Symmetry: D2
Subunit: 154 residues, 4 copies
């Protein structure tokens, strides 16, 4: 029985801490580009999704670590897609929060591996995908990415 | 195993004829507003979809019928959503094509019924929904709506 | 957010009347065989589904009309599958109910068409499928099939 | 466009190593009971699934560790369901293959946490779920569980 007008997708996560503010890009039809920043953790994180064959700029999550290395991951959409996302969660001492944040991220597509970005220190996590696609990102962000999760769909 | 970067949704239809030119809005997360025109058939058909909580203007399919009455169904999204779409398919003599078109359309939500619009002549068709949502429209259009179909999702 | 332990599928329908008693086979991974009976309407309707590569007999819905012609539709699973199901709904006078029942049914796969079975009288209905599969049947049955619906999945 | 008669579900994993023999229970409508054994790792792993309101015993994966302690996790289906599965993957001294096996497993439902079972040594992994359900298990087994994966559905 349908009780709401908003469609849904499987959602896994979040991995990371309770700090920062929650955000959810929602779901689309695929991923075209990922723009992030990294240093001793992951700072900025924004995505260019595919929306029915055309690019759609997702909401930005710039964080607040201007010193970080900026990176643009341009996927050969639609032939290239993520088959795994992994990383590390843990406290970043200098933040003085005592809460876990995303210290590192690695993106593996059917074509190549991007990363590891940030610092691989803390507790690892990984989401290998055998069938289906990540069609959206969600998480929490403050000065850095506190947590991350994914929307999945066939 | 995943072999493409484009996600998908269930698709039903089309109902109608082979005339006009094919179009497919793709899929989104919901429906906010439906714009259409009608007279002896359904002429224009355009939708304002929901895309993760924000409106997204779907591609237009105005057809070309100056005399048709225009209707703007503004749903109380997300509390109100379609639970059924029905109508009639059949030849419209004046088009001189001999091909079926969408003569009528009725939209029923969990709150009320909109229509019938057009003329209920020809062969009826209906898509009652018990679980899930219409998240996108597709079809064919010329001077009027030749055919219509739907993308469905939970 | 997940609030129940039972998974779900999109469900379309029901087409037919409010008579009889409700039944729902639930969802599986495909359809292998359909056994029905027909005359001036569709009486019995029972399915053998596929469950992860192996046959699984669903609950029976024989109705209570013993005089109909019995038919067995054995699909070449998994290469052959339904791409459309259509039929007619309408009153059957000898039932003395004045409520619609399933008068006729037609099953079209990517290989061939089965039917029409029963009597093509009343109001037609059709469910053409472009993407996705019927993975379960539901409906209402009394003396004959009063209504029918489908569980859909990618 | 549909090109096969078998439906599908999202599949995540595998977590663990390449040893043992691959197995896949397929997908169902939920989980009713989990039977496993553990010692210096996870040995046996068998599940009783829900299939449209009726239990369905999945194929067994007994492994081969007579000394392992057996555990039966009977969920209060459908009110109780897994919201997270986590564990550890790592080498076993007695295997001398340098390849990982599932050393530990922890099952968290919306009602309680079962485990940890086995030994929490090696590299941790976790699959927290925010929306959707695990409707099937897959993996690899020899004397113990080498790897594990999940079928997911809304």
């Amino acid at each position: 029985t349908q009780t709401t007008g908003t469609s849904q997708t499987i959602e896994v996560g979040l991995w990371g801490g309770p700090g920062g503010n929650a955000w959810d890009d929602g779901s689309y039809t695929g991923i075209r580009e990922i723009n992030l920043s990294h240093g001793d953790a992951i700072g900025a994180f924004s995505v260019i999704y595919d929306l029915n064959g055309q690019p759609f700029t997702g909401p930005t999550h710039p964080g607040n670590e201007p010193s970080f290395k900026t990176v643009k991951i341009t996927l050969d959409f639609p032939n290239e897609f993520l088959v795994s996302v992994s990383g590390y969660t843990g406290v970043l001492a200098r933040l003085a929060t005592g809460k876990d944040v995303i210290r590192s991220l690695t993106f593996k597509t059917n074509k190549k591996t991007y990363g590891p970005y940030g610092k691989e220190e803390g507790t690892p996590f990984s989401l290998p995908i055998e069938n289906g696609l990540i069609v959206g990102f969600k998480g929490r962000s403050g000065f850095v990415v506190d947590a991350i999760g994914f929307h999945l769909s066939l």
